[PDB]
Amino acid sequence: SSGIEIAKPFVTATTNVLSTMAGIQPIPGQPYVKKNNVAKGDVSAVVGITGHKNGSISVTFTKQCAIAVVKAMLGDDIQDIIQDTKDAVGEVTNMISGQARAALSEMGMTFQGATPSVIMGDGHTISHVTKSPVIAIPFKTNHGEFTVEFCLE
Amino acid sequence: IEIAKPFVTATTNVLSTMAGIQPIPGQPYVKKNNVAKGDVSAVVGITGHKNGSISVTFTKQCAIAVVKAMLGDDIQDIIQDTKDAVGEVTNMISGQARAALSEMGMTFQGATPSVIMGDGHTISHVTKSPVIAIPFKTNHGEFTVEFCLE
Structure with missing residues (x-):
């Protein structure tokens, strides 16, 4: 009904990608239906999907986590943040x-x-525009937190 | 840029019919920077003929005027x-x-x-294609529509 029942493919993909690319040992928490109208954070990314239903996948990182990902993927010394x-x-x-x-x-x-698209700026917000519930999955890592969100309508 | 025309037509039509605002389109250009900076943005992905995205980045002044117009000046929660x-x-x-x-x-x-808020945030399109930007002038400040296709 809400989409929470199909959280697994999004969670597994997120865990596998972050593990492989960044080595930050991502650990997902329990998916939840978002009750707030925003995700607040420091670096976000968002990507639309289309099919039987249309929707979106976003990720909102804390500053520490986004920096750790960039350093893991491109090196400890950051050329141009x-x-x-x-x-x-x-x-x-x-x-x-x-x-x-x-x-x-x-x-x-x-x-x-x-x-x-990639969004930057400390404490920005991102909000999904949809008739459906938005499903959020919080993560711990070795270098701070992030949350994956998705929706389908 | 011929491919920009549908996006200009849509932008101008939606803001006039829905928000009482007449945007004056400028010349589309290929972006030379890696970001668009602003106070309120929105972005929506597209697929099919090509995969891509459409974004709009507003100054605060323009975004407030759009929201007020659409809410009949009865803004209860910005x-x-x-x-x-x-x-x-x-x-x-x-x-x-x-x-x-x-x-x-x-x-x-x-x-x-998705709608993005936060003063002076940036949005960047992730693509190897060029990003096209269309500047608009309004009675309430500037905004830009960007799109890419790959």
């Missing part, structure tokens, strides 16, 4: 989209994926 | 109201732009939008 954040988080997001949609296809649901 | 009003505008820009694209032989599906 804006460009490297765009590139590293953008690739992570493309990979989460590809892997989550591959998992969904194996469950008989084909989705296409749009191009991601 | 966060919720911005989400709803800018979200609806973005949904309609996507729908109308894709209808105009279908008229030029390119069929696209649209994802659900």
